[PDB]
Amino acid sequence: GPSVFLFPPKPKDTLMISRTPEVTCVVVDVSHEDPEVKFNWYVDGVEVHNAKTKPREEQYNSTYRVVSVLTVLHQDWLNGKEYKCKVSNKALPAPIEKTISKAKGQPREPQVYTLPPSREEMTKNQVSLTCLVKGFYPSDIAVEWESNGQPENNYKTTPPVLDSDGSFFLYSKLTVDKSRWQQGNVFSCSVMHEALHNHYTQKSLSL
């Protein structure tokens, strides 16, 4: 029969007060003969009724994709409230109940360190600027680079890695033309995480 997948909000929508975080309940393998999908939403066991249904999408594999979205409050999600989506469909012998929430565990503040390029790299065309983000929990995070107030696109960030002390760490590598680094421009590692003061911190880096 049809299957249900309940997704958390984007970490950026939960930590940035200008954005709106939403929990998404995706129902796949919806049949054409019984496309009706009843949605029951519960926040900490209490049913809520402010969820909207996304437009039905034909998947061109003989099934429908039916999606419900519930806006959540920022502090509600960050305070670890549980959101239950109950999906009902005539192709289901019994309703499917899924429940998600923020990763449990005490949030730990990330330590952000900028590491300059190695002296052995200055023989290449482009050098590597390193940002070490360690000791953070939960794993949800976002890392970006910028120079003189302008965003820097040419960078890659490793996924979070579980450390030996139960926290997470990652690395972000910004690649710049060696001339830029030797020019002396300041580069900034911008890290977003719930356990940071105001969910944000910057660490500069220059020669």
């Binding site: 007060i17 200008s18 977003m192 105001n198 944000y200």
Partner: peptide
């Protein structure tokens, strides 16, 4: 107090 990133209001204490 408040933090700002690229001009977007992040958060305020």
């Amino acid at each position: 107090d408040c933090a700002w990133h690229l001009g977007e209001l992040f958060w305020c204490t």
